[PDB]
Each structure stands twice: as structure tokens, then as C-alpha cells.
Structure 1
Amino acid sequence: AAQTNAPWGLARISSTSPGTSTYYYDESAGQGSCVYVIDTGIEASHPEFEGRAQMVKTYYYSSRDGNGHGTHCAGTVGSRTYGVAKKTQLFGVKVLDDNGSGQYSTIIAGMDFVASDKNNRNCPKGVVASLSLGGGYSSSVNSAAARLQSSGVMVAVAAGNNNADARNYSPASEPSVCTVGASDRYDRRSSFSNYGSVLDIFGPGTDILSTWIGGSTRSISGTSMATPHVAGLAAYLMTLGKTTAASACRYIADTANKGDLSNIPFGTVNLLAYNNYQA
């Protein structure tokens, strides 16, 4: 399948070169997979989600996304126009309030929720969780992310936007999950992207167009935007039967575009998420 005039990040993820504008992918499109977006919520009524998104949990007075961030990330995972895995099932878990803030205890509870809740969902092709969030190092936050991964969920987490070593942030620093840095449309490490040995992969993160609340769209930047590219890529590959939740991060690293990013600090992987789709 070919989507013309796609957001640059989608085109990037199916290309061996920067500078193109068509996204190419297998029509299976993540059907039969599930992605949990653990964030500020998802505006499930957005036409871009086509009835494939729903809120399954909130820790606040509403499950509505009053911020936009979770909706944007969910759109990069699975919206019809802005998404990597255009037929996946999207599940919103609102651990972040409408200001985009959340206590670590809430975030941990949300991760343990997803590990159990997947057993209440139909995801025959497998389950992914996208965590575009983080704070300072916490062993308990890392452990929760490790449990979620261990439970059979492909966990993708933002490296963080501090232009610093991700070793000092959680859940970024949890080794067993997939820690995602950000790149721009010219294949530079994004200016704000964290780096370090703990990164597994980079995805598009600067100037990413996606869904927003009020049935809208906008472009924003962050490792928060790179993460759902990788989460959607995992769901797509799992639907194709090419990998599993336990092995998807490794598979993505194995099959990445290698050595093509600039301003990657010595000791950080130079690997850019790539679907290796050939028609």
C-alpha cells in the first residue's frame, strides 16, 4: 500500500533515504494487534480513529484527553492518515492529567493495569504499549516497565527531551524495554533528544503532524512523537508475524537503517526505525 503526501515521519519509516513523501506498508496494517497509549488519554471520537480507539482506564475525574498529547501520540500509532499501523486497536490509559502531569504511583498502576487488562482484550497478533512520558530515575518506575514487558507486551518508551544521557530518566533507563530517541527530517538527532547506551532505536520526532483534541491536527516535536512511531511499527511487524512482543525491539534494531543519522554521540546507537517493506 502507498499513502501519498504522508507526514514525513511515516515516509521516513518506510524509506532507505530521507526526503521522500510517500508511506509504503503492507495492507495488513496492524490488524489484530493492540496498542495501549499510556498518556493524557485519547479523543476516541476523532474521525481519524474510525472507531478503533477507546478509553479503557483513567485515574482522574474524566477519561477525556483535555490536553491533546495522548491524542497526538495515539494518532501516530494508529490514525488513518497520521498513523504507522492504520488498522490496529488503540486503548487509552489516562495516567497523566490534563496538564500532562502524573505521579509515579499512578504511572506504575497504569502499567500494571495494562499487563492485566490485555487479558480482557482481543489481540491475537500481539500487544504493544507506548509510553511518551518520563521523569527522573526511579527503580520502581523501571521495575513496572520491566514487568509490563515481561508480561508479553512490547513496551516502547520515550528517551526524554533533555539533550542528556537517558540513564538518568525513567522509564527510559529500564534496559529491558525499547527506549526511543528522536530524529528530524534531515536525519539529524533531534536537538532535544536524549542519548546514551540505553537507547535502542531512533524514530521521527521533530515536526510530527498528527491528531489533536477538538477533532483537529497539529505538528509538535519530542521523543514523545518518536515513541509511537516505534510502537506502531512493532504492532505492524507483529501482525505480519515477523516478530513477537518479547523480540520486537531487537528485531527493529536488527532491521533499522544503520549509520544514517548525524550528531549521534559516540556510544549511542545509530539506528533509525525502518519497516523494510518491499512491494
Structure 2
Amino acid sequence: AAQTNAPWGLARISSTSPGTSTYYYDESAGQGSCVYVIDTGIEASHPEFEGRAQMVKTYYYSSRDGNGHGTHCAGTVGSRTYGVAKKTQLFGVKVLDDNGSGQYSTIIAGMDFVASDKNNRNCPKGVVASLSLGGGYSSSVNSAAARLQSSGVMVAVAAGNNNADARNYSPASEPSVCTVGASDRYDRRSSFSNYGSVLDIFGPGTDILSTWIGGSTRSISGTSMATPHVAGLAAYLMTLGKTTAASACRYIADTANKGDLSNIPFGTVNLLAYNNYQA
């Protein structure tokens, strides 16, 4: 399938080259998979989600996304226009308040929530969790991420926006999950992107168009935007049968565009997420 005048990032992870604007992907489009978006919520009513988004948990007075961030990430995962995996099922877990902040205890609870809740969902093609959040190093946060992964969920987490080594942030620094840095439309490392040996992969993160609350759209930047590209890609590839929740990060690294990014510090992977789709 081909989506013309796609957002650049969608075009990028189906291309061996930057600078194109059509997204190509297998029409299965992640159908039968599920991706949890652990964030500020999701505006499920957005036309862009087509009935495939739902809130399943909140820790606050509402499960509505009063921020927009979680809605944007969800859109990159699976919205009809802005999403990688255009037929996945999207589940919102609001660990972050409408100001975009959250206690680590709450985030940890959300992670263990997802590890259990998947057993209450129909996801025959597999389960992904996307975590466009983080703060300073916490072993208990990492451990929760590792449990969720261990439980059979493909965990994708943002590297962070400090232009520093991701080793000092959680859950970025958890080795067993898939830590995602950010790149721009010219295949440069995003200016803010964290780096380091604990990065697994890069995805598009600068000037990423997606859904926003109030039925809207906007372009923003962050490793928060890169993470759901990889989360969606995982779900898409699991639906294709190509990989599993346990092996998808590795598979994505294996099949990445290699050596194409600039300003990747020595010791950091030079791998850009790529669906290897050939129509």
C-alpha cells in the first residue's frame, strides 16, 4: 500500500533514502495487534482513530487527554493519516497528568497494569507498549519496564531530550527494552536526542505531524515522537509474522538502515528504523 503526501517520518521508515513523501506498507497494517500508549491519555473520539482507540486506565480524575502529548504519540502509532500501524488497536493508560507530569510510582503501576491487562484484550498478533516519558535513573522504574517486557510486551521507550547519555535516565536506561533516539528529516540526530550505548534504535523525532486534542493536528519534536514510530513498526511487523514481542527490538536493529545518520556519537548505534517493505 501507498500513502501519498505522508508525514516525512512515515515516509522515512519505509525508505532507504531521506527526502521522499510517500509511505509504503503492507495492507495488513498491524491488524490484530495492540499497542498501549502510556502517557497523558488519548482522545479516542478523534476521527483519526476510527474507533480503534480506547482509554483503559487512568490514575487521575479523568481518562481524557487534557494535554495532547499522549494523543500525538497514539496518532503516530496508529492513526489513519499519521500512524505507522494504521489498523492496530490502541489502548490508553493515563499515568501522566494534563500537565504531562507523573510520579514514578504511578508510572510503575501503569507498567505492571499493562503486563496484566493484555490478558484482558484480544491481541492475537502481539502486544506493544509505547513509553514517551522518563526522568532520572531509577532502578525500580527500569525493573518495571523489564517486567513488562518479560511479560511478552514489546516495550519501546524514549531515550530522552537532554542531549546526553541515556544511561542516566529511566526507563531509557533499562537494557532489556527498546530505547529509541530521535532523528530529523535530513538524517541528522535530533539536536536534543539522548545517545549512548543503551540506545537500540533511532526513529523520526523532529517536526513530526500527528493528532492533537480538540480533533486537531500539530507538528512537534522529541524522542517522545520517535518512540511511537518504533512501537507502531513493531506492531506492524508482529502482524506480519516477522518477529515477536521478545525479539522485535533486535529485529528492528537487524533490518535498520545502517550508517546513514549524522552526528551519532562514537559508541552509539547508527541505526534508523525501517520496515523493509517492498510493494
Deviation at 1:145, TM superposition (A): 0.1
Deviation at 1:74, TM superposition (A): 0.0
The aligned counterpart of 1:30 is 30
Q: Deviations over 1:56-81 (max 9, x none)?
A: 00000000000000000000000000
Alpha-carbon distance in 1 for matches of 2:6, 2:101:
31
Deviation at 1:165, TM superposition (A): 0.1
Q: Deviations over 1:16-44 (max 9, x none)?
A: 00000000000000000000000000000
Alpha-carbon distance in 2 for matches of 1:206, 1:101:
22
Deviation at 1:92, TM superposition (A): 0.1
Alpha-carbon distance in 2 for matches of 1:136, 1:259:
29
Q: Deviations over 1:123-175 (max 9, x none)?
A: 00000000000000000000000000000000000000000000000000000
DSSP-derived class of the 1:172 partner:
coil
TM-score of the superposed pair, with normalisation by structure 1: 1.00
Deviation at 1:206, TM superposition (A): 0.0
Q: Which runs of 5+ in 1 are unaligned?
A: none
Alpha-carbon distance in 2 for matches of 1:5, 1:112:
39
Alpha-carbon distance in 2 for matches of 1:241, 1:232:
14
Alpha-carbon distance in 2 for matches of 1:19, 1:47:
28
The aligned counterpart of 1:93 is 93
Alpha-carbon distance in 1 for matches of 2:75, 2:230:
13
Residue identity (%): 100
The aligned counterpart of 1:273 is 273
Alpha-carbon distance in 1 for matches of 2:43, 2:195:
31
Alpha-carbon distance in 2 for matches of 1:41, 1:167:
27
- Divergent runs of 4+, >4 A: none
Alpha-carbon distance in 1 for matches of 2:95, 2:208:
23
Deviation at 1:257, TM superposition (A): 0.1
Deviation at 1:4, TM superposition (A): 0.1
DSSP-derived class of the 2:51 partner:
coil
Deviation at 1:237, TM superposition (A): 0.1
Alpha-carbon distance in 2 for matches of 1:60, 1:101:
12
Alpha-carbon distance in 2 for matches of 1:43, 1:137:
30
Alpha-carbon distance in 1 for matches of 2:211, 2:81:
9
How many residues are treated as equivalent by the alignment?
Answer: 279
RMSD: 0.1
Alpha-carbon distance in 2 for matches of 1:220, 1:145:
26
Alpha-carbon distance in 1 for matches of 2:269, 2:116:
33
DSSP-derived class of the 2:42 partner:
coil
Deviation at 1:258, TM superposition (A): 0.1
Q: Deviations over 1:179-216 (max 9, x none)?
A: 00000000000000000000000000000000000000
TM-score of the superposed pair, with normalisation by structure 2: 1.00
Alpha-carbon distance in 2 for matches of 1:240, 1:119:
21
